[PDB]
């Protein structure tokens, strides 16, 4: 331990260690509506395990879902009815038999699995749903009991409370949103909160037995994605919707006006006009960022790891004032920085963020995202038009970062290559290895697992090579989307190939 | 400036701007003895220029060489002379004739050689370097006037005097080494040294002359490369020979004995060993002095190079010592070696530094932390990326951004060589990660490998990009006959390359290396 001096014996053997946290991996995208059976979208039940187990034999390590919060009437995930609870259509009927909510009888005949269509499946589940939530409450074992554990538990009053009461009063009330709610609901007076609980009791009490029963459903998927080695990453956006419970019961972390309609809401310029309520962040700064605290911390009960969609809004955001009918009217204002991922990291320990940063950034949300250690994204599917600086071509991946084929807002590759612009083709064809084009997707598999890229993420479509049909969502267009489930004759146990194939690709470049 | 406040008006513009230190490049490494031309090596001139313009018609931005020094017999520039002359034989007798230091019809008639003989090579051009430096030491206008400018300059002089009397001396004892030297001379008397300069000043005077017309030469080639938009990248051995100027002239910086011989020499343990017999720096010493011998060294470097390679980097923080005696390296200790204070003391002295550390095969954590602590790439080696599994450091997708990735380099075989004997095992395993086609185009497979990599620089020798078999093999180690010798085939000009120019531009242009 001195300059010309004689080291120790085993010199030789004070070799390199790879860094664990650096260790490559690979991952599905599929959300749990995709599933097959019988009730008109995919749940939490059997094809869940069967799924996890799959993935497992390929050497995938990675489980990536949409938001599993409870959609808009389309389906959509990203404009969801509130930030914190979990989508009741994804609660499995049969395992509510298993737990005796349900008698055999009960359930409903099969219908036709082609797509997901919302409507349908709240007519035929829900019923079924109350039922069991019905019975659960009026029973007093060992269920009912974990109901209360539940329900009391202070990391889920926080967020659950608030919801029920928002949803009991929509549901009493007809009205557009909450703005229109008579002066006392709207402003949340305590006595007539309370005259809520009364009048309301019974709807309040099934709401939160519903949560309970999608809390235990979608733990037991958890733990046994935790058994097979397998880490689930989830997704949440930005902004949460103004009809909410999010806003409605914390008005002042919200740019409201003093009747409570937002001052400015958010979008981006040439422009995009998304039309949701902003965040006081200089208010939030105050308390610490709590509410921010807390929505993390539900993301860190549901998901392992969770991505945030336009991320670049915590260093700069695009602000238009809610009169406007575009978005080209508004000003970019200061985000919170890291500040909020300090406290973050405070409240709630070590946290696995991936940031959505698609399009074009500037240089304080390059340098923000550094900041935390959080990977982006690339998107090969991007990577082919422009020049040899594109971020997604993969000789311009890095380490620290996300690659997927493609995500749910893009075609499939097959659909994706059917409609390419031949400039972009024939530069495709270059750089990328490809035998017979029915079989584009592997090669564009292929590339994603050859980067240096630490984490690689393939939707399920694109392993099962299908087309646009299959197409999860269409940014910019109100129906059809959200709708896509597995083939219903394609069973897990008839996709060995595909998995073998997986597995060769991963073992080839590292990945298992 | 505020959290919730307004941005001023052109946030949108405030768009990431790629680094410059970070711009992806290639090159091709090419010593300089392989140009073509009629005097049996080649050399500094008319070549040199016309490489230069091809490389840069490719796209490339990096021309890497072999060290420069004073070779030994055999041709290797390893086992130099001297660690910081510049080997004579390089000097254009043409370049000369522009100089007035030659008249045209004192040229030779060409020979053929396929091959560098350097015997042929110095009995050839030699007479003719002598006499141009002759005329210049007898001149007494502009020319004499630079050599004086070169001679006085007190960063030449510190290896360039030391170096020109130990060649003197070598010259007129009949000695293995200077251990074996009188006493006066093995122990530089000072009245000794005065007693050389007179009894020896033709010799020293035309020594120091030939050092600056390879200078001068040296340097024109580096202001074309310049001019044209590529870096030259060289190469440095961390140990020097005993019997060299570097350490008759500075032996208290080395592990010497009393009488002057080394108590113990380099090397590597086995995995017997191997036994280099290098003499080994006293890096305590260096420490008193601030380094001053390695700082001038480096000087040197920079005078010579934009860029350089150190081989056996791991050196700096631990080396194998080997008792002198042995015959053997397998009875050594491993020694700590100067790590980051030297690089300090050179920054320090010589200012921003841009080295490669040679890292490969086994190496232990304090050289990738001492590598990483003072920012140098490291190398992969496509050819050695096929044995093992799938987390072999030399697989493109291990590779790092600050990193050199060649194909393989002048200790390799070429790629077409190094095909034809690989291992079933490896040419399966190869053949499912690379793109290739014909076997006749296996070279350019592995280097379109190497341009996709995220590597920032890929350098490719000029014997792949000519898809040359095993005869074009520079070098094989622990071999002593038949090395350095390749020359680009005497038919094969620069104007017959724009197949091959247009082929790799492509490649650069595909993978963001332009």
Redesign the interface.
């Known amino acids: ?7 120790p014996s085993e ?2 053997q ?5 860094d664990p946290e650096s260790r ?1 991996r690979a991952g599905v995208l599929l959300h749990p509506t995709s599933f097959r059976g019988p009730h008109g979208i995919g749940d939490l039940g059997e094809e869940a395990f069967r799924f996890i187990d799959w993935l497992h034999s390929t050497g995938c390590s990675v489980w990536q879902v949409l938001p599993l919060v409870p959609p808009d009437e389309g389906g959509s995930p990203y404009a969801g009815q509130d930030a914190n609870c979990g989508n009741t259509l994804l609660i499995s009927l049969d395992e509510l038999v298993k737990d005796g909510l349900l008698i055999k009888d009960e359930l409903p005949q099969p219908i036709d699995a082609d797509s997901v269509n919302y409507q349908t499946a709240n007519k035929l589940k829900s019923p079924l749903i109350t039922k069991a939530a019905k019975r659960l409450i009026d029973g007093n074992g060992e269920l009912k009991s974990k109901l209360l554990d539940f329900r009391n538990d202070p990391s889920i009053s926080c967020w659950l409370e608030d919801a029920a009461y928002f949803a009991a009063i929509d549901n009493t009330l007809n009205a557009y949103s909450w703005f229109e709610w008579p002066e006392p609901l709207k402003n949340r007076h305590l006595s007539a909160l309370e005259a809520i609980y009364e009048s309301q009791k019974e709807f309040i009490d099934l709401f939160i037995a519903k949560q309970f029963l999608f809390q235990r459903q979608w733990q037991k998927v958890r733990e046994y994605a935790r058994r097979q080695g397998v880490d689930i990453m989830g997704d949440m956006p930005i902004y949460v919707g103004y009809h909410s419970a999010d806003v409605w019961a914390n008005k002042k972390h919200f740019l409201l006006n003093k009747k409570g309609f937002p001052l400015l809401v958010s979008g981006v ?1 040439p422009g995009q006009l998304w039309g949701s309520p902003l965040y ?3 208010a939030m ?1 105050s308390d610490q960022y709590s509410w921010w605290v807390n929505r993390i911390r539900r993301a860190q009960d549901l998901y392992d790891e969770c991505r945030i969609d336009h991320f670049r809004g915590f260093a ?1 955001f695009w602000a238009v004032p809610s009169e406007a009918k575009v978005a080209m009217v508004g ?7 890291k500040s909020l991922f300090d406290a973050i990291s405070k409240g709630v320990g070590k946290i696995k963020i991936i940031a959505e940063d698609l399009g ?5 949300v ?1 340098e923000l995202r550094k900041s935390i250690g959080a990977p982006g994204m690339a998107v090969l599917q991007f990577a082919f038009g422009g ?3 594109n971020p997604h ?5 890095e380490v620290n970062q996300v690659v997927y084929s493609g995500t749910h807002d893009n075609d499939t590759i097959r659909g994706w290559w059917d409609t390419l612009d031949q400039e972009e083709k024939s530069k495709a064809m ?2 990328l ?1 490809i035998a017979g084009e029915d079989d584009i997707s592997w090669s564009v598999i292929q590339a994603a697992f ?3 890229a630490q984490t690689a993420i393939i939707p399920m479509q694109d392993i099962l090579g299908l087309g646009s049909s299959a197409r999860m969502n269409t940014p910019a267009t109100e129906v059809g989307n959200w709708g896509w489930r597995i083939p219903s004759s394609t069973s897990f146990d008839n996709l060995e190939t595909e998995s073998d194939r997986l597995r060769d690709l991963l ?4 990945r298992l």
């Open positions: 331990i001195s300059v010309g001096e004689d080291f010199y030789e004070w070799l390199p260690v790879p490559r310029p006081d962040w200089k700064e700069g000003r970019w204002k200061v985000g919170p920085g074009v950034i500037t240089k304080d390059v020049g040899a600086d071509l993969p000789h311009n991946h270059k750089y290895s050859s980067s240096t073992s080839l470049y590292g």
